[PDB]
Amino acid sequence: QVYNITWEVTNGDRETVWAISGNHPLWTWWPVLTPDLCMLALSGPPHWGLEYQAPYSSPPGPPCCSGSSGSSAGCSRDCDEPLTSLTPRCNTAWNRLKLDQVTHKSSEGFYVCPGSHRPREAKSCGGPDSFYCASWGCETTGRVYWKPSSSWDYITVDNNLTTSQAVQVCKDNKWCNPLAIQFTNAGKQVTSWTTGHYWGLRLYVSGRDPGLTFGIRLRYQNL
């Protein structure tokens, strides 16, 4: 029968950071989840600068002077200055510009590693501390030069908006790192979404490759 279905994307702490809803039969609606990469980082690892921010919190950082709202007291010009010296993170609008640049550059990007649902072999990759992959070749999706793909992976993650689209949203001080997550044929067959599943998304940069843990789960209520 038809239920009010809702797909929730949760941070590493399994707290709902994003959600979509609709009236559909169970296991028949598979929308393109579009959570922000920063929303996954809310109350996440300290690198992203949102370790103390609660889910659904407003984007931190002062507005860019180039934003649609125009100049204001305390507005930042970092959003126009070169981003080469900035760290890719979500604590400020210019840091979000740098994160978008890192996530869109061909030589860089992000790779997502399966977690609990992964097979025993993939279990060798590592635990959540390593974002479910401490060794190369453990990523099933994400935007990188080698373009990983797995038949048994439940989801595929990519950048929802291009750099040109994302820059303006960043300058507005809004969340501007959306991630398009699409359920795979294997994921659609899976009916354990109610329990929820977890992945680890790591940036492909020069260094530790900072990452976070996110999850997807399904709820349904009477229509």
Binding site: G49, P60, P62, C75, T87
Partner: protein, 546 residues
């Protein structure tokens, strides 16, 4: 072109002169600008690098001045030791250094005085005279700086000399003010200003276009730290006054290097303390543009302290200013007396017994540069000129250490593994060629390390290959220079690691030069073109050695 020429103050006095000249605009005005724009709290580190480079050059001078019995500027030593073209380049760079130092210190002092009295002079300048060229020329022409330079040039022409007593008194006042600044910063300032985050990225004033960086100790990254160090190298300039003055010294060749090193270390300590105080009392992005130290004191509630600083700065900026204005004509006169520059600059007035024409010309040029260009532009121009001069002197020391005592075909065995115990002409030629190749390779490394910095990070094959090959070949050439025997001629003072230390000094100086913006490089290129035009049109033919 290569023609060479035939050639009491206590150590504490030399230290006082060096501290007086060195301390000034660099700490009282530029410290806040670097803290706000280039590096944040990491400005404390920016000075450190700029200090070490300043030390590396200074040590070379100790040897460079040790080779010439007659004390004087680096132009004197170069024209005695290496030749005529190199001496002209060094003297031209020193002339640029002195002129632009006069201009920049006059700017900083005029701005400080104008702010002290409520910025009426700057307001009048904006009201009645705007250059209208923000990109290149200054938005506000500093007429007061022109007046100051005119007054001081008039004083110098009429025979006013260096009052060592006044210099000592002003240096003592400035050092007391700097100590007060350090103590007030450590009392009122807090470490929290070095740990700012996006929660604190809000200057409660109504300013806009504020660069908040990443926050923390190093908001703008190590690239910003290096840019700040290149800018702060300006602050350590002026220690050359000890040798330049030419007044009799109790132990010239031994006191001069010791005095230079002591002055550099004292200035480094003062700059470190004052910059730490400035960045701890007030956020780096909150620092006042016009008056960083008085602004920080006002932020902490010690508003009246602006007067105390207003004294100390106006003292230091005075002693610093003369520190550039007194040597400024002398070098020209020397270059005019040796025939490299126009002979009319060497003319001495009967009434004053001073090079009136040279002083007037240098003062007019400095006044024009102050009228047209911003403080930071002049600072960077002087920094690039001074860095080139320092690198040239370091190369001079490196080359001369291996040359045989003055009055092509080669073999691999003699180059790699010479067996002569003392240098020969062949060894000197090998060392000269190695120095030229090493300078070219260091320039290549610095170019790749700055222009190709992202390319090196990106790991592109060409950039990494060029970097690795250039570094390995630099090491190889430095080794070739190592294998050659050093001249056994005794020297009063020597560079401890003359085959490595001068190379490191050259590398650091060139790298800092690369950090400067394109406008500074263009201005420096135009100045060098003018110098070469004068040399090859007039210098060669009218040289007294001809």
């Amino acid at each position: 072109m290569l023609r060479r020429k035939v050639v009491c103050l206590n150590t504490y006095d030399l230290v006082a002169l060096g501290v007086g000249s060195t301390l000034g605009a660099g700490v009282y005005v530029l410290a806040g600008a670097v803290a706000r724009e280039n590096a944040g709290p990491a400005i404390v580190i920016s000075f450190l690098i700029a200090a070490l480079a300043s030390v590396l050059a200074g040590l070379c001078y100790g040897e460079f001045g040790a080779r010439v019995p007659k004390t004087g500027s680096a132009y004197l030593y170069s024209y005695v030791t290496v030749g005529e073209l190199w001496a002209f380049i060094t003297g031209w760079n020193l002339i640029l250094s002195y002129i632009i130092g006069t201009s920049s210190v006059a700017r900083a002092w005029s701005a400080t005085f104008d702010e002290l009295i409520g910025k009426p002079i700057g307001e009048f300048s904006r009201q009645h005279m705007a250059l209208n060229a923000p990109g290149v020329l200054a938005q506000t022409p500093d007429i007061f700086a022109v007046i100051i330079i005119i007054i001081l040039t008039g004083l110098l022409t009429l025979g006013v000399k260096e009052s060592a007593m006044v210099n000592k008194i002003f240096t003592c006042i400035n050092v007391l003010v700097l100590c007060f600044i350090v103590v007030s910063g450590f009392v009122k300032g807090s470490i929290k200003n070095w740990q700012l985050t996006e929660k604190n990225f809000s200057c409660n004033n109504n300013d806009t276009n504020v660069k908040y960086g990443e926050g923390g100790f190093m908001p703008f990254g190590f690239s910003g730290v290096l840019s700040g160090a290149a800018t702060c190298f300006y602050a350590f300039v002026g220690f050359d006054c000890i040798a330049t003055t030419g007044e009799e010294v109790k132990n010239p060749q031994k006191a001069i290097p010791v005095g230079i090193v002591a002055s550099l270390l004292i200035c480094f300590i003062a700059y470190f303390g004052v910059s730490a105080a400035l960045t701890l009392m007030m956020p780096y992005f909150c620092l006042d543009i016009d008056s960083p130290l008085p602004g920080a004191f006002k932020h902490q509630g010690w508003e009246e302290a602006k007067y105390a600083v207003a004294i100390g700065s106006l003292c230091a900026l005075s002693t610093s200013l003369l520190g550039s204005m007194f040597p400024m004509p002398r070098v020209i006169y020397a270059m005019a007396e040796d025939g490299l520059l126009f002979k009319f600059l060497a003319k001495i007035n009967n009434r004053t017994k001073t090079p009136v024409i040279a002083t007037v010309t240098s003062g007019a040029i400095a006044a024009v540069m102050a009228f047209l260009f911003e403080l930071k532009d002049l600072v960077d121009l002087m920094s690039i000129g001074t860095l080139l001069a320092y690198s040239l002197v370091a190369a001079c020391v490196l080359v001369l250490r291996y040359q045989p005592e003055q009055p092509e075909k080669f073999s691999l065995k003699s180059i790699l593994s010479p067996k002569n115990v003392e240098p020969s002409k062949f060894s000197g030629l090998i060392v000269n060629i190695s120095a030229g190749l090493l300078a070219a390779l260091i320039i290549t490394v610095c170019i790749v390390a700055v222009l190709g910095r992202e390319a090196l990070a990106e790991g592109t094959l060409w950039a990494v290959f060029v970097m690795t090959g250039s570094v390995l070949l630099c090491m190889l050439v430095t080794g070739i220079i190592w294998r050659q025997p050093e001249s056994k001629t005794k020297l009063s003072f020597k560079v401890p690691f003359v085959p490595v230390l001068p190379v490191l000094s050259i590398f650091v100086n060139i790298y800092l030069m690369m950090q400067l913006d394109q406008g500074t490089w263009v201005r420096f290129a135009v100045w060098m073109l003018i110098g070469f035009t004068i040399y090859f049109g007039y210098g060669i033919w009218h040289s007294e050695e001809a």
